[PDB]
Design a protein around this ligand. Structure first.
Ligand SMILES: Nc1ncnc2c1ncn2[C@@H]1O[C@H](COP(=O)(O)OP(=O)(O)O)[C@@H](O)[C@H]1O
Ligand SMILES: N#CCc1n[nH]c2cc(Br)c(Br)cc12
Ligand SMILES: [Mg+2]
Length: 327
């Protein structure tokens, strides 16, 4: 069957922490007072929650309330424990409270409010310097959560809030996050389609923190090349074909061979044969202001089929692409 894999960093962080840290099912939720929060307006509804802008009447501060749906109500302890474990970490959204919503009768997570800049506005206006600055800020959040034994598993632009006015970034939406345990087989139905790593698309379950580094690479490629999204698959199968049209099929087959993976036979008629394209193929007059040899080298080291071969968040922070960023 498939060959096992383990992370090259932070491998045993959960084995050396007390059971209380990662055993989220045994966690006893401390409930706050729902009357402290007055809902103001509905910001949206996802597959798992309804999100509202609210005011904390004990200090007149704005907050965001995520009211979980019954489907979500199952693995809520996992999101709660992860949020409490990471609380206070660099660029991690702060969970302010947990209350029982009187209408849904489900848990409602109360978060710090971010006066975030519109995501299309961010995509259209961030400069070369801004992209480097903000990529460094998201790497601080990812190295922190990885060092804490957690993988986010849903890195994408909408989960990376930026308040451009205060040069403030927060990594949000920890509902798909998981504790990393060496040898554990995880569900591959994580991350949004365009950000899914090759490990998920070929059904390799023994993945790790490096999944987040693929997703970050997808964000970087879209930003510097002005192509939203960078790998535009029509479904999860075509998603792999789009990746293979850029990275080539030979390295894909080497990756499948190394981990002894049985590729779904539905790929036999759609993958074809493709060479790796040099990153300069994607450069044009409308994106040249965001591309540099350092950006291309950094991107090249994130977007690798072999999850064990990708830069870790800490190695990424050492890259020359960030030398220009004021620290
Ligand atoms: N702390 C926050 N500050 C401001 N807006 C937020 C905050 N958290 C979520 N939002 C808003 O709510 C939505 C994202 O919610 P999210 O946690 O990603 O949902 P889900 O877990 O169902 O996928 C977006 O519309 C975003 O603008
Ligand atoms: N793509 C896009 C816009 C956007 N949303 N969130 C982000 C976080 C970062 Br880090 C960067 Br760069 C760009 C964005
Ligand atoms: Mg989200």
């Amino acid at each position: 069957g498939p060959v096992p894999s383990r992370a090259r960093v932070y491998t045993d962080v959960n084995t050396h922490r007390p059971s209380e840290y990662w055993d989220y099912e045994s966690h006893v939720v401390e409930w706050g007072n729902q009357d402290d929060y007055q809902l103001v307006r509905k910001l949206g509804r996802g597959k798992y929650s309804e999100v509202f802008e609210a005011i904390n009447i004990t200090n007149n501060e704005k907050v965001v309330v995520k009211i979980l749906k019954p489907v979500a109500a199952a693995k809520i302890k996992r999101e709660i424990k992860i949020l409490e474990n990471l609380r206070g970490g660099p660029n991690i959204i702060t969970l302010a409270d947990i209350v029982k919503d009187p209408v849904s009768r489900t848990p409602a997570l109360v978060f710090e409010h971010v006066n975030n800049t519109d995501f299309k506005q961010l995509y259209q206006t961030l400069t070369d310097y801004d992209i480097r600055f903000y990529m460094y800020e998201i790497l601080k959040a990812l190295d922190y959560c990885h060092s804490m034994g957690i993988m986010h598993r849903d890195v994408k632009p909408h989960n990376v809030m930026i308040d451009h006015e205060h040069r403030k970034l927060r990594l949000i939406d920890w509902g798909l996050a998981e504790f990393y345990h060496p040898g554990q087989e995880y569900n591959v139905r994580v991350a949004s389609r365009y950000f899914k790593g090759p490990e998920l698309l070929v059904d390799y379950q023994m993945y790790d923190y490096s999944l987040d580094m693929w997703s970050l690479g997808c964000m970087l490629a879209s930003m510097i090349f002005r192509k939203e999204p960078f790998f535009h698959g029509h479904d999860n199968y075509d998603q792999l074909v789009r990746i293979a049209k850029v990275l080539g099929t030979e390295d894909l087959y080497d990756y499948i061979d190394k981990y002894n993976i049985e590729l779904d036979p539905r790929f036999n008629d759609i993958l074809g044969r493709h060479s790796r394209k040099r990153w300069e193929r994607f450069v044009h007059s409308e994106n040249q202001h965001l591309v540099s040899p350092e950006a291309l080298d950094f991107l090249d080291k994130l977007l690798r089929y072999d999850h064990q071969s990708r830069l870790t968040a800490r190695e990424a922070m050492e890259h020359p692409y960030f030398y220009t960023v004021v620290k």
